[PDB]
């Protein structure tokens, strides 16, 4: 058991598209979205 070091070092290597790459990576898991029934409020 160590309590002396910092275990949150991954974010030192994050890049400009890191957040959006993960979001794209997650699309395969999402349940199908619900539909309001039209294309947009102006349709």
């Amino acid at each position: 058991f160590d309590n002396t070091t910092y275990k949150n070092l991954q974010h030192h290597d994050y890049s400009t598209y890191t957040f959006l790459d993960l979001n794209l990576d997650l699309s395969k898991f999402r349940m199908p979205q619900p539909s309001s029934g039209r294309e947009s409020p102006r349709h």
Partner: protein, 429 residues
């Protein structure tokens, strides 16, 4: 109980607050997260809401509303629209940085809280609105969410309970006002972060016009542990109607500014010296404390001597717990300049939608700037007090109140300083 604030480590909820253990799924599980999540989900929303109610949990976002009752507005038959949980991670209140630590060091507690809290509300998904400056924190949360998806803890058949739940992360673009619950919803919908009038309340017409509950990160993140250990365990900490543990941020003029978890109702002096290492220059050097973020009125040293940190105690002290972000100011502080900077902050953050804050807060900012230099007359102090009362209670959202209260606190306890500055300026001109 009469004394509070010697919380044991075994009773602490955010056990990776300092990021000294693996923040990822393997470490989170080793620390008790995600344990028996299926059983909680199978107990049903009424059981989950019952636990949240008996814990006496209150909103940790700054308003302190009873969580169990608030979450119960969503327990109703579906009318065809989807139901959503929106988790507030906007963290904009100056002095407050607690939600940042949860998001980056205990992300799996927040994700599990979203599933448990979402189940009680009947929501199909959780939208986590995190401020856009927290880029690295948001990426940590997304990494944790990907881990949970791949282990089946969320998504279709979450934790094997047959409940489908998605967790989305949406980033802001730089607006303190987007922490307000209806402004947050409008921001998620792609508009300016301008609050909505109420009614309708979000539980009826919310994000995308659908039933919605907005919950602070800390309020959500503790819900799985309240369910596992029970509301009675949580309610055994702090005074009645002030239950549980709380994350505190001690910044300003203290030897060791820090974030720490402590029991609700701990003495303010006890908190500052046990955890922050005391006031810079010793307790006698203390001038004033803002006990709950920039929106709560300051209290002077005399009040700080014996005030407890909970919703009721600080209200009786003519302030509020707020986010429990303690800003400390010692005798070397220009107190007028310190508050003026907060009014300047609220001037920069006001959405501009409604008249008393769009015009009033900018007006108060101009008066405070002259008060800093002493370039005013003593009659203007009562004018400024009256102006702040014309903003409070007359605006769409509470940002207007949050700008008036700091001014009222300064006039309440530091009028002679304001008048002394005016004398100096007049004497020199």
């Amino acid at each position: 109980k009469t004394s509070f604030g010697s919380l044991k480590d075994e009773d602490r909820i955010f056990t990776n607050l300092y990021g000294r253990h693996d923040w990822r799924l393997k470490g989170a599980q080793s620390r008790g997260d995600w344990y028996k999540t299926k059983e909680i989900l199978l107990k049903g929303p009424d059981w989950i809401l019952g636990e949240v109610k008996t814990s006496g949990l209150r909103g940790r976002g700054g308003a302190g509303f009873p969580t169990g009752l608030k979450w119960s507005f969503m327990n109703k038959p579906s009318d065809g629209r989807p139901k959503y949980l929106v988790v507030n991670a906007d963290e904009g209140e100056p002095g407050t940085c607690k939600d940042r630590e949860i998001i980056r060091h205990d992300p799996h507690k927040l994700v599990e809280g979203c599933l448990v809290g979402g189940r009680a509300m009947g929501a199909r998904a959780a939208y986590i609105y995190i401020r856009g400056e927290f880029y690295n924190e948001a990426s940590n949360l997304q990494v944790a969410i990907r881990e949970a998806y791949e282990a089946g803890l969320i998504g279709k058949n979450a934790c094997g309970s047959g409940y489908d739940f998605d967790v989305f992360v949406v980033r802001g673009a730089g607006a303190y006002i987007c922490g307000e619950e209806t402004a947050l919803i409008e921001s998620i919908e792609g508009k300016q972060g301008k609050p909505r009038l109420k009614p309708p309340f979000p539980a009826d017409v919310g994000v995308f016009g659908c039933p919605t509950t907005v919950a602070n990160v800390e309020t959500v993140a503790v819900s799985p542990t309240i369910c596992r250990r029970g509301g009675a365990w949580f309610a055994s900490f702090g005074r009645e109607r002030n239950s549980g543990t709380k994350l505190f941020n001690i910044s300003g003029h203290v030897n060791n500014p820090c974030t720490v978890e402590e029991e609700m109702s701990v003495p303010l002096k006890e908190l500052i010296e046990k955890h922050a290492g005391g006031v810079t220059g010793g307790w006698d050097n203390l001038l004033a404390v803002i006990p709950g973020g920039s929106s709560t009125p300051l209290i002077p040293k005399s009040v700080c001597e014996t005030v407890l940190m909970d919703f009721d105690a600080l209200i009786q002290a003519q302030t509020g717990l707020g986010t429990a972000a303690v800003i400390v100011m010692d005798r070397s502080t220009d107190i007028v300049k310190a508050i003026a900077r907060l009014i300047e902050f609220y001037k920069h953050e006001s959405c501009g939608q409604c008249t008393p804050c769009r015009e009033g807060v900018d007006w108060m900012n101009k008066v405070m700037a002259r008060f800093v230099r002493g370039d005013a007359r003593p009659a203007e102090i009562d004018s400024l007090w009256e102006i702040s009362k014309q903003i409070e209670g007359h605006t769409i959202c509470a940002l207007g109140d949050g700008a008036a209260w700091p001014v009222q606190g300064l006039i309440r306890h530091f009028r002679p300083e304001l008048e002394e500055r005016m004398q100096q300026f007049a004497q020199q001109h």
